[model samples]
Target: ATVYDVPGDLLVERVAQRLKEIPEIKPPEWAPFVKTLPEQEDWWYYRVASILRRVYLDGPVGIERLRTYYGGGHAPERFYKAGGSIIRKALQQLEAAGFVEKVPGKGRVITPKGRSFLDKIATELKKELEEIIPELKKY
Candidate 1:
């Protein structure tokens, strides 16, 4: 099954637990928002997983590309971009963990380690879903 079929929060939570060893994954002093930080809880974990998934789908990606990739949302009618520093920091930590590697001019690409980590989770999720919903076997 595709990663999209898996429960996002559960998948990201698992990824976060796996990446918790990297110190740089911690949040910065200032939050990404000026108002109440509604999105602070488990922020790093979600960011890390999203970055990994994005790289897996679109490798040789750069920070600038990721900034736009992660950006968007807010006023539904008028979408705004997310902070680059936040995306940048998360990428740095992922790189430190060996899950992602920079490609000089090409940006970041997932390592075999990263692929296996995500693939293993996706496989388990697919199997779990299949057991719960036998009809899914048809697809």
Candidate 2:
């Protein structure tokens, strides 16, 4: 087994690289459904999914706020609604796959496995980004 010891002086750039390489752990499919995304009007399904993971990491943001923050183009209500629908469906799929946990009376939370998966993927992505963009300093 490969063992990796995460340094106490870990940096965001390293972590970001790690995230890019571990796509299976947290596919970039859920980011668009969450709130607070890139300023771009168009977002890929996978990218949206990725953003969703970040949103969850940030906190228990409700669906409404997620929609507000990550909604599609302005002027086309249907566009965002459709995107939201896709997000909910994707969430259900994740839940069914045991990657996300939901409580009827409470907000959703990532299971231990889910959290581990996200962290691993994120770390791997950071490493990858560093290799490609060597100018970035880990610390």
Candidate 3:
């Protein structure tokens, strides 16, 4: 199943829940003020999913590339960069869960188990979507 087939929010929530099972991913002191997604409870879990998805989509990706992806335009046409430490922490946590592995020269790549997990979720989501809109099955 393609990643685009699954709704982002749904996949993020699922990944977050799965990551929560890893004790290394407990909420940090700065979670409340996370610049990327501020004032949101359980934001850590969301970040976990975001990072995992990135690594899956772009294997051998580095932290700098990820930071740029997360960063975006700010108010008044200014640029806003996401916090590096937060992204790093999320990657490390995903690694702890065995979802991603660091390659020597390359950055991170999704493990077989991680890919299967994402594919299963994507298939489930596609099935649920098709139930709502049967015409989607034609594709």
Model 1, which residues run further than 4 Å from truth? 1-10, 21-24, 29-40, 73-82, 135-139
- TM-score to native of every candidate shown: 0.71, 0.50, 0.75
Model 3 regions lying over 4 Å from their true place: 34-39, 73-82, 133-139
Off by over 4 Å in 2: 1-48, 73-80, 135-139
Task: Flag the better candidate by lDDT, 1 or 3.
Answer: 3
Name every residue pair that clashes in candidate 1: none
lDDT of 2 by residue, 13-124 (tens): 3333443454433444444566752223223334434533644464344444455556643342454455576555556655664556665645456666656655675576
Instruction: Give the Cα-based TM-score of candidate 3 against the true structure.
Output: 0.75
Rank by TM-score (best first): 3, 1, 2
Question: Which of the two, 2 or 3, has more lDDT?
Answer: 3
Tens-digit lDDT string for candidate 3 (36-129): 5331677887777778888988889877677767864223222423466677778887788788889998888999978887878778777877
User: What is residue 79's positional error in candidate 1, in angstroms?
Assistant: 20
What lDDT score belongs to each candidate, Candidate 1 first?
Answer: 0.71, 0.48, 0.75
Number of clashing pairs per prediction, in order: 0, 26, 0
